[PDB]
Amino acid sequence: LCFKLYAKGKHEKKTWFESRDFCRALGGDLASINNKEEQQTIWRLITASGSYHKLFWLGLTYGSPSEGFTWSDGSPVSYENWAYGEPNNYQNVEYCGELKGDPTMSWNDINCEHLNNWICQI
Ligand SMILES: C[C@@H]1O[C@@H](O[C@H]2[C@H](O[C@H]3[C@H](O)[C@@H](O)[C@H](O)O[C@@H]3CO)O[C@H](CO)[C@H](O)[C@@H]2O)[C@@H](O)[C@H](O)[C@@H]1O
Ligand SMILES: [Ca+2]
Numbered sequence: 831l832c833f834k835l836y837a838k839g840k841h842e843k844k845t846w847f848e849s850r851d852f853c854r855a856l857g858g859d860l861a862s863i864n865n866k867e868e869q870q871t872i873w874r875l876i877t878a879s880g881s882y883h884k885l886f887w888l889g890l891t892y893g894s895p896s897e898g899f900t901w902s903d904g905s906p907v908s909y910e911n912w913a914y915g916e917p918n919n920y921q922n923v924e925y926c927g928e929l930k931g932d933p934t935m936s937w938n939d940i941n942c943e944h945l946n947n948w949i950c951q952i
Contacts, residue, residue: 831951833861833872837881838947846926849887849948850902858952860889862901865909869935872949876931883932887948890927890937899927899939903951912937 836852844852850860863869876882889902899907899917913930917939926942929935929949940946 831858833868833875834950834952835872835875835879835881835886836948836950837879837884837886843945844887844948845945846887846891846942849946849950850889852948853950853952856950856952858950859903860887861949861951862889862903862905863909863911863929863935864905869909869911872929873931873933873935881931881947884947886929886931887946888927888929888937889951890939891942892925892939910937911935 853859861872863872890899891902892898893900901907913936916937917924919939923941924939926940927937928940928946929937
């Protein structure tokens with residue numbers, strides 16, 4: 831699968847659901863990061879575009895209380911790269927996952943209605 835970053839204009843950020851719909855409209859989905867190689871591919875996409883210091887929706891979304899986080903594309907949640915302290919379900923309203931697009935490439939749970947950049951896979 832090919833990844834593509836979407837860091838558009840200031841008023842062009844999207845909720846998690848809007849981002850998922852955008853990627854699905856192109857025949858793909860929000861990006862799942864299944865291992866370190868895929869993480870590196872995305873990090874180099876960030877360096878290549880110069881789209882530094884941005885946050886991006888990934889395909890992380892909460893399932894049932896039993897299962898916790900899942901990937902929107904159905905991939906297993908094998909690899910995890912949560913930032914320290916995450917996921918923390920801050921104020922009980924955080925059911926989607928974002929990537930901090932810095933060298934650590936760490937993940938944070940955040941409210942799904944937050945407006946973010948996003949990363950698709952096709
Ligand atoms: C939502 C939060 O995101 C990260 O923490 C950031 C922090 O979130 C604030 C948020 O701006 C505010 O609306 C809420 O009421 O309190 C949160 C906790 O301080 O904001 C600071 C900037 O002030 C940084 O951007 C933090 O990264 C994440 O670390 C948390 O787990 C949580 O998902
Ligand atoms: Ca959080």
